[PDB]
Structure 1
Amino acid sequence: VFYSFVLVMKPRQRRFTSQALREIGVAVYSNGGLIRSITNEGIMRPYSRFRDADNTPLTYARYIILQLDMGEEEMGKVDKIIREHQDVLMALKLNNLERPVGIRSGNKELQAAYFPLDTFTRLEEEINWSPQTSADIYTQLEMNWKEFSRTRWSSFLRN
């Protein structure tokens, strides 16, 4: 991804969650950027109690993942927009997604010298693995590899 966010939010009535997410989204569109994926997660129990705008500590919070394509200039604006919203407890930001840690160290990349387009195409989920991932995806990966490489040109040279 170009940018990503993890947004720890207060667990409110659904109409409010939807309004808040519409506000963040519109704040991203106005600033001339895109949303790769807005992923929803449940109301979880974190390891740290968060206080909201009421200064009332919270045991539970709704987690929400943002993945954005912006300019680095106007994500300052979106940053202090998101962090200043009352329904967001915490937001952590990943800017490292284009050059993550495991590449371009003493010619680790075979047949290319730092191809940037490898990790840009990808989403955050495949750059940073989630805990549930097991050896099983090693299977799926390749059925999604081989299959892809079969249909790509034929699909592209159609139009």
Structure 2
Amino acid sequence: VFYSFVLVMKPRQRRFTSQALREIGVAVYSNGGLIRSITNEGIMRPYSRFRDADNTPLTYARYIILQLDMGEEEMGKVDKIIREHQDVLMALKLNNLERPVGIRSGNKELQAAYFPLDTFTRLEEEINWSPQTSADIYTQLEMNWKEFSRTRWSSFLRN
């Protein structure tokens, strides 16, 4: 992934959030960029209540992961569009996607010994792992799991 954003948005109506995401995608595509992915993560209750433009503390918020491939000047344009949006309370810019964290400030001998195509070609869920994600889930995809998981409920149906 070239760039990723975690958009925290106000839980408005469906049409307002749809228009906000549509304007964000239009600003991405008009500057000559590509959307790798956009995923909605539902409404969760954060540990800190963000304030909107009219200084109202919001208890709930919607999280959206946005993975993009854009040029850096155009990414600055889209970031200035996103950070000045009325519905976006907070959005961090994941700029450590091509190079992993700890290489630049870590060991000096282990600085040019990495491969950027290892991290650039995979998605953001394969770089920053979720708690439900693990290596055995990745090995299950290449092991022909359809012919093996058909017998996993043969003991629980009778009890």
Fold agreement, TM-score > 0.5: yes
Overall identity of the aligned pairs, in %: 100
Structure 1 window deviating more from structure 2 (50-59 vs 135-144): it is 135-144
Instruction: Provide closer, same or farther for how the CA distance between residues 105 and 64 of structure 1 changes in structure 2, counting only shifts above 3 A.
Output: same
CA contact 2:10–2:88 (8 Å) conserved in 1: yes
Unpaired runs of 5+ residues, structure 1, are: none
Separation of aligned partners in 2, 1:156 and 1:30:
54
Deviations 1:52-90 (A, max 9, x none): 122100000000010010111221111110000101000
Q: CA deviation at 1:6?
A: 0.2
CA contact 2:103–2:110 (8 Å) conserved in 1: no
Instruction: Provide closer, same or farther for how the CA distance between residues 157 and 126 of structure 1 changes in structure 2, counting only shifts above 3 A.
Output: farther
Separation of aligned partners in 1, 2:27 and 2:96:
22
Q: CA deviation at 1:117?
A: 1.2
Separation of aligned partners in 1, 2:62 and 2:103:
33
Q: CA deviation at 1:11?
A: 0.2
Instruction: Provide closer, same or farther for how the CA distance between residues 67 and 141 of structure 1 changes in structure 2, counting only shifts above 3 A.
Output: same
Q: Give the ranges of 4+ consecutive aligned residues of structure 1 lying more than 6 Å apart after TM superposition.
A: 102-112, 144-159
Instruction: Provide closer, same or farther for how the CA distance between residues 90 and 105 of structure 1 changes in structure 2, counting only shifts above 3 A.
Output: closer
Number of matched pairs = 159
CA contact 1:104–1:113 (8 Å) conserved in 2: no
Separation of aligned partners in 2, 1:109 and 1:146:
45
Instruction: Provide closer, same or farther for how the CA distance between residues 27 and 134 of structure 1 changes in structure 2, counting only shifts above 3 A.
Output: same
CA contact 1:52–1:86 (8 Å) conserved in 2: yes
Instruction: Compute the TM-score of the two structures, normalised by the length of structure 1.
Output: 0.80
Deviations 1:8-41 (A, max 9, x none): 0000110111000001000101111000000111
Deviations 1:66-118 (A, max 9, x none): 00101112211111100001010000010110011266999999999432211
CA contact 1:5–1:65 (8 Å) conserved in 2: yes
Separation of aligned partners in 1, 2:153 and 2:110:
24
Q: CA deviation at 1:3?
A: 0.4
Unpaired runs of 5+ residues, structure 2, are: none
Bigger radius of gyration: 2
Instruction: Compute the TM-score of the two structures, normalised by the length of structure 2.
Output: 0.80
Aligned CA RMSD, in angstroms, stands at 9.3
SS at match of 1:146: coil
CA contact 2:40–2:63 (8 Å) conserved in 1: yes
What's 1:32 paired with? 32
